[PDB]
Amino acid sequence: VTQDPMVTPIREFAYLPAGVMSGHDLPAGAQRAGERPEAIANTA
Amino acid sequence: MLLKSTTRHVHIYAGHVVDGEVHPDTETLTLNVDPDNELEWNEAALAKVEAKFRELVANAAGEDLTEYNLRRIGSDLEHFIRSLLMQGEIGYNLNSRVRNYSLGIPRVNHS
Amino acid sequence: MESGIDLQGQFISALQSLGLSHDLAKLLWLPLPMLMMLIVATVGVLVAVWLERKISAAVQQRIGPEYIGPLGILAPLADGLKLIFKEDVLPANSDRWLFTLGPAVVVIPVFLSYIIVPFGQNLLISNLAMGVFLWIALSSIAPIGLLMAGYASNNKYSLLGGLRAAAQSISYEIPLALAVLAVAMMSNGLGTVEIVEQQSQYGILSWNVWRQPIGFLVFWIAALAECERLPFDAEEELVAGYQTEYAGMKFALFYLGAYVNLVLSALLVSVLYFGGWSFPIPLETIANLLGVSETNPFLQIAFAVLGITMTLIKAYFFVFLAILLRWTVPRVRIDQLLDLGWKFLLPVGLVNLLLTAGLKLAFPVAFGG
Amino acid sequence: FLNQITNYAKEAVQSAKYIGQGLSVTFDHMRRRPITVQYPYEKLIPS
Amino acid sequence: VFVLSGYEYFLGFLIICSLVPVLALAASALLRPKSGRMIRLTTYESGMEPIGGAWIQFNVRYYMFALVFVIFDVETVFLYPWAVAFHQLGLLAFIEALIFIAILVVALVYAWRKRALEWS
Amino acid sequence: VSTELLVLGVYGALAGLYLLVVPAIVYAYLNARWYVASSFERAFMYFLVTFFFPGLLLLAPFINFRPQPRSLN
Amino acid sequence: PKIETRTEPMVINMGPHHPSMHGVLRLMVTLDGEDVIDCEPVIGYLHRGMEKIAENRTNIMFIPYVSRWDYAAGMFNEAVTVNAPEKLAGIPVPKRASYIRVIMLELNRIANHLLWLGPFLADVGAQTPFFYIFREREYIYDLFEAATGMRFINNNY
Amino acid sequence: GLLAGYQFVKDLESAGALALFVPPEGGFEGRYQRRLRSKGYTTLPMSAPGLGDLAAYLTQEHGIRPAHTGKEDIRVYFQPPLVTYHLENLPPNAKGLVLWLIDGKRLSKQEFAYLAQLTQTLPKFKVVVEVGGDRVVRWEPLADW
Amino acid sequence: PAILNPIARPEVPQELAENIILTSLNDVYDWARLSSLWPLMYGTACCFIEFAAMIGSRFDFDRFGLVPRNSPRQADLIITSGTITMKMAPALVRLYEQMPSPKYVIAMGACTITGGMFSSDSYSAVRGVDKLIPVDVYLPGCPPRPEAIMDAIVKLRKKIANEHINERGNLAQTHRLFTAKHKMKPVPPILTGQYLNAPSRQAP
Amino acid sequence: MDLATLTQTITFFALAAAVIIAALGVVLLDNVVYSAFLLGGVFLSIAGLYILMNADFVSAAQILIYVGAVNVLILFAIMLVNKRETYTPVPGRWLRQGGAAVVSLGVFALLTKMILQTPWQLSSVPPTPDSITTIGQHFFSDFLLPFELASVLLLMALIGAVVLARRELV
Numbered sequence A: 001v002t003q004d005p006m007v008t009p010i011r012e013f014a015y016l017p018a019g020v021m022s023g024h025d026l027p028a029g030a031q032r033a034g035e036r037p038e039a040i041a042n043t044a
Numbered sequence B: 001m002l003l004k005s006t007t008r009h010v011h012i013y014a015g016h017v018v019d020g021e022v023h024p025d026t027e028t029l030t031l032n033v034d035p036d037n038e039l040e041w042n043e044a045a046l047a048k049v050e051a052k053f054r055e056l057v058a059n060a061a062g063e064d065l066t067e068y069n070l071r072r073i074g075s076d077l078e079h080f081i082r083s084l085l086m087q088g089e090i091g092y093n094l095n096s097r098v099r100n101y102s103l104g105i106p107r108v109n110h111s
Numbered sequence C: 001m002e003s004g005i006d007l008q009g010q011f012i013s014a015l016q017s018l019g020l021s022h023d024l025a026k027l028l029w030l031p032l033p034m035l036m037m038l039i040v041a042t043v044g045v046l047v048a049v050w051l052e053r054k055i056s057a058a059v060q061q062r063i064g065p066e067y068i069g070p071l072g073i074l075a076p077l078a079d080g081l082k083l084i085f086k087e088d089v090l091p092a093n094s095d096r097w098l099f100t101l102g103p104a105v106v107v108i109p110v111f112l113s114y115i116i117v118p119f120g121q122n123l124l125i126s127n128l129a130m131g132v133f134l135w136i137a138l139s140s141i142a143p144i145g146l147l148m149a150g151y152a153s154n155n156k157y158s159l160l161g162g163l164r165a166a167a168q169s170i171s172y173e174i175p176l177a178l179a180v181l182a183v184a185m186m187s188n189g190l191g192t193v194e195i196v197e198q199q200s201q202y203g204i205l206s207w208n209v210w211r212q213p214i215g216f217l218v219f220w221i222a223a224l225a226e227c228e229r230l231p232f233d234a235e236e237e238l239v240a241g242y243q244t245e246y247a248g249m250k251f252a253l254f255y256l257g258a259y260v261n262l263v264l265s266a267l268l269v270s271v272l273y274f275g276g277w278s279f280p281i282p283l284e285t286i287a288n289l290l291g292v293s294e295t296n297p298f299l300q301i302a303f304a305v306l307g308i309t310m311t312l313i314k315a316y317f318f319v320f321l322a323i324l325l326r327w328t329v330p331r332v333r334i335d336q337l338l339d340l341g342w343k344f345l346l347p348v349g350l351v352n353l354l355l356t357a358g359l360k361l362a363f364p365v366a367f368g369g
Numbered sequence D: 001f002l003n004q005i006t007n008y009a010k011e012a013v014q015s016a017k018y019i020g021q022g023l024s025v026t027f028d029h030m031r032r033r034p035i036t037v038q039y040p041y042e043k044l045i046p047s
Numbered sequence E: 001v002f003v004l005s006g007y008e009y010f011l012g013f014l015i016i017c018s019l020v021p022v023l024a025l026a027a028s029a030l031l032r033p034k035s036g037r038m039i040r041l042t043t044y045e046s047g048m049e050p051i052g053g054a055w056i057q058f059n060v061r062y063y064m065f066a067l068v069f070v071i072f073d074v075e076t077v078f079l080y081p082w083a084v085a086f087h088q089l090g091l092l093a094f095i096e097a098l099i100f101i102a103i104l105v106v107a108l109v110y111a112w113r114k115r116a117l118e119w120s
Numbered sequence F: 001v002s003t004e005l006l007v008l009g010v011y012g013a014l015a016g017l018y019l020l021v022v023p024a025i026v027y028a029y030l031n032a033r034w035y036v037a038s039s040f041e042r043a044f045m046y047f048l049v050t051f052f053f054p055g056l057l058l059l060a061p062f063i064n065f066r067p068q069p070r071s072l073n
Numbered sequence G: 001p002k003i004e005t006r007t008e009p010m011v012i013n014m015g016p017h018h019p020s021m022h023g024v025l026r027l028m029v030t031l032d033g034e035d036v037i038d039c040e041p042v043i044g045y046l047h048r049g050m051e052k053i054a055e056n057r058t059n060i061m062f063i064p065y066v067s068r069w070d071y072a073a074g075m076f077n078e079a080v081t082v083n084a085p086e087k088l089a090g091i092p093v094p095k096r097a098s099y100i101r102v103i104m105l106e107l108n109r110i111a112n113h114l115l116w117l118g119p120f121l122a123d124v125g126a127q128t129p130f131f132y133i134f135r136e137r138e139y140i141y142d143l144f145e146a147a148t149g150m151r152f153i154n155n156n157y
Numbered sequence H: 001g002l003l004a005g006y007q008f009v010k011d012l013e014s015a016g017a018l019a020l021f022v023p024p025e026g027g028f029e030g031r032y033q034r035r036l037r038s039k040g041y042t043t044l045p046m047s048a049p050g051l052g053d054l055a056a057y058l059t060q061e062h063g064i065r066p067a068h069t070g071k072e073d074i075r076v077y078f079q080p081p082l083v084t085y086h087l088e089n090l091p092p093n094a095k096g097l098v099l100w101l102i103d104g105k106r107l108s109k110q111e112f113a114y115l116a117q118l119t120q121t122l123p124k125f126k127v128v129v130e131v132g133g134d135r136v137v138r139w140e141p142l143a144d145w
Numbered sequence I: 001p002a003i004l005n006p007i008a009r010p011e012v013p014q015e016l017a018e019n020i021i022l023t024s025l026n027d028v029y030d031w032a033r034l035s036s037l038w039p040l041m042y043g044t045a046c047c048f049i050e051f052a053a054m055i056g057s058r059f060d061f062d063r064f065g066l067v068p069r070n071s072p073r074q075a076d077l078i079i080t081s082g083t084i085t086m087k088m089a090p091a092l093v094r095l096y097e098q099m100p101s102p103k104y105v106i107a108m109g110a111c112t113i114t115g116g117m118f119s120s121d122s123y124s125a126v127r128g129v130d131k132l133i134p135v136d137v138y139l140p141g142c143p144p145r146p147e148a149i150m151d152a153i154v155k156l157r158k159k160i161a162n163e164h165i166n167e168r169g170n171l172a173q174t175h176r177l178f179t180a181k182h183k184m185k186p187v188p189p190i191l192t193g194q195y196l197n198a199p200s201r202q203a204p
Numbered sequence J: 001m002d003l004a005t006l007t008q009t010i011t012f013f014a015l016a017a018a019v020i021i022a023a024l025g026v027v028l029l030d031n032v033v034y035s036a037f038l039l040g041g042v043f044l045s046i047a048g049l050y051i052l053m054n055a056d057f058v059s060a061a062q063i064l065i066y067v068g069a070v071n072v073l074i075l076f077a078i079m080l081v082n083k084r085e086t087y088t089p090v091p092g093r094w095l096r097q098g099g100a101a102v103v104s105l106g107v108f109a110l111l112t113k114m115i116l117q118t119p120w121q122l123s124s125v126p127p128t129p130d131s132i133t134t135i136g137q138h139f140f141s142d143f144l145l146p147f148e149l150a151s152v153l154l155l156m157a158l159i160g161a162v163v164l165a166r167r168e169l170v
């Protein structure tokens, strides 16, 4: 879906970062919610 | 209350048609072989289906006039119509608007 | 054109220049304003369907009927054209004369009532000295096509729906008549040219909505129950709605007659209680401020276009208010709307008529003459 | 005894104010951006 | 002698507005599927056969609403020439029309109090 | 020049504006600000569709309000 | 037009074609003037035979079937269909699995009450927030689609 | 609004296999299929991802092996070769057969090259593979890809 | 026979519309029936809720042109959105037969393509809606997400734009009408509408 | 008869034929709903006839009351008494129908004789187009007592038709 040059693909709700409800106002590909398990292994 | 068995390729309609209306009669029942024209229906196989239908409605004497027995008659006639299509006496239409092969794809006989 | 602009006189004069009679030139002029008004009603029903499907989408945070034209502009036209292409059904013992005539009887007087509506002074089909009273009399023919469409189907729930729609459609004729009666008191007549002319004196202060604040409300609520709209119309009342047996062009007749009645009723709210064509500043004030005469043809053209824009602004505003109020109000059932018609709008219309008669007798310079 | 006439007009004006308020707040729905995922040009990504 | 002005367009617009559903239905009937060698003729009845007898109930509410419509429709058509000829008539005609309106207001109170304006 | 011909000229100019020019301007205004518009601006542009609707109907099979092809880069 | 007008009570069908979100049931009511005298509900237009299908299905291949009874809160059906061999064999569940089950079941209860609430406000006459209820139901759909893979029903979760 | 003539049938008779570029919103290319069918062709509209190994499905016999739902056996069904069975079961004076593939996407370049070469080899057979996308209906020959 | 379920050779049928005016009017006809496409508000099972998810605001139903209709007489399309049982099948054939002739069917979900998960051990599920109705577009997915349903609608629009206006005549019914007299006993109507007024609820 | 009086005579004869044909259809038709709709046809053609003889308010009153209210009431009562009665023809049908036809034709011949025989005092002055203003001046003049008595007539008619068409379940 992201490799069709006629579609602006939309992340639905569970991939919008941490305060976003609809995936229409997304500026440039902001990620899902936040950190991933390769971050707390570096944090703690 | 009109008693009927409407599936594809047969419509039973216990009653008689008058003009464009079927009036519910007790002691008769109609037959509407292929009301949507998926099959071709030359007159030999059409007479075969008519004779099989009259044999089926004669063998169904003495039972109730429920929709269950009408559905049984229509399903046996459906199996007969599919057997004629499988024997090669009946072809698919190919002038229709759908062409979805509701009684099996074309296939060669043995291999 | 030199002295003024009169397309009727110029057309009759230029058609007598070919060698025709005078009465024959008038007869050949006759279909042209009628064809223009049918064009106005047809673009009105297309605007009404488009505005209905777009404002309803904008309320529900959707996008309307896209991919049919640039915006959804060709969406009503296809919805017209498809209904021309669909076949007949004739529900199983239908009358086959009353069945086809029901839509015709319910939409012919609504089209015929477009003589009454002006888009400017003498920018109408006829003045018709009993104008709005003839509009009310012609709108009273609708619960005969309703009962015809209810009866001529061999099923019930449409006969019941037909009796229900006819009982709804006669419960709001009398408050409509009383609210028009107050304006006919204040205007000393029934012709819509004279009704607007008694408001196009001071621009916006002489509009009838300031002098009939409750008569405008009675007319608006009663005209929203004559058009089969809002609360007065998601499972149906019982199972069916008097037009559940109509399929092709006859359902298209019902469908376009509803929106043509909506556009006509919005135009008549604009004509009766607002200025029919008047700017909120009087036009002769601008004509004397410019210094140019009010009879030279370019000010005639500019004032005619300005009157058409004022008519269409107010008619659009009330079509917009109907499409907003379709999703604003709760849908009321049949008994609450008949109680609104008989127990609320009829006594408020009667007390409005009594107080506007008392106001015309007491203060006659403010309320007519 | 006008206790049911003034109550009648009070119910009428309370319904009129309710319709005016609901008409004001359905006019604040048109200003919101539509949430429509416009399918053939805005195919939403599956998870 | 016919002295009414504006009705030379009323007859022509009645003719053309009567022909526009006729022309719409004729243009529909020209380009349409002429089809259906089996039953076009079925009643709806929410998806199946006609259930429960082909009748509706006698209910006199259909009479009562049309009856009060007749009465107050006659009232309004009497009130129309009083209303348009009000600027040429004084306080006495207002008192006489007030007597008319008051008697039919008593008629409305009767139609309200007796259960004649009811559900439908 | 005759003044009847100039009245017919301003008639033709008003017809060309009402049917072709300002409907094209309204179309160029509606693929423009439509979501940035408020409720009152949406009512105003719906009025602009309402008033110039025969011109919008004439210009409707010639405008191509489809989204442009993406870059994928 | 063979509809006569009797004085006996009529019969209203309200058959299996419901033009709203009411399911498939007949509601043959009599209703003489307006008072509903009798009401025979005809049931079984979606009887597909899950009780006979279940006797020929393993529990790991009947979990895709059990979303289709209460198909607005689908996982509730899995919440008994999983819990029935769980309490015969005595298989314990983890605490994290139990809390994930509680979260999924309460989200399904919210979604079930939302799908009740839409048609209920549309039938009572509100009919404005019908299109605003499916928005939060789509939020729950996209929550279920991340974890379970599918939306409101076909979860093998 | 784009009154299209019969140039599409001429580009089809020229190239033999043309890739269509349809707007993805629906039916704006079926006017060309109806123009093509009005010139005497027989169009065979079928979905391309359902076909597998077009050398075997189009011109060869292929065992279908339909779904037994735990009840029947494997029960292989030998479907006839689609292009040659629809070409032999045709009028002898017809213009030919046209395979109208409605999903040109999710197919490989090898299958495109095979479809173009198949339209080139046997005489009356043309394909209108719909690779989709473009803002208007525009078509190219299936030459480069 | 060497071909088991054969197709048949047509009668060399061609319209041969060399006219460009009637071809453009055919384009207008196909675009008009294409861009309106009013479906029946028809449910019956799980899939209907995804169908209802098209009518909502997140995916828009109307932006292809189609508004749902209550009566089948105004319905242009029927999306069979759920399982067709042995009880629901005559009702479904009746509400398909009550539509005007340019009508279209979409077999939504696996329950109407083949009777998907009830195609094995069910005694009361019609295995596919094409055992009852001529189907235009088949739509897989057990709950097909609304993008898939308005993909099936896109393929239906591609189907509609191909239809010729001279080819109307495939919209027929082609009666055969074989009448036979039978000797079955009529039974009384078992289901009448008497539930609480039946004289068995009052006392044992 | 250039174009205006020709149109007036053509409209008069078309509406007269419509009144005659639809009134015969009100009487001589078996289906009573066809009579109940042809009655509205009669009333509409009579309103057109009133439009022809310079009575526009009375024509609008004819549309508003007879078509709008009286025909709607008649159709409602026709749907209320709608059954499938047999109506077996009595053997003495000649004594009713032939006597009724000869009485109607005798009254028509007598009325046609006195209409074509009487020297009516035709006016040469054109009538007033402003009918509703003179009718409103008449209602509070010469015709004031019937105007006030019509309210009491309507009140009594509403009272009696509410009483007789009621159910008194007590």
Ligand code: SF4
Pocket: G068, G153, I045, I046, I047, I081, I082, I083, I108, I109, I110, I111, I112, I116, I141, I142, I143
């Ligand atoms: S296909 Fe799946 S979701 Fe659709 S009706 Fe059948 S079981 Fe329910």
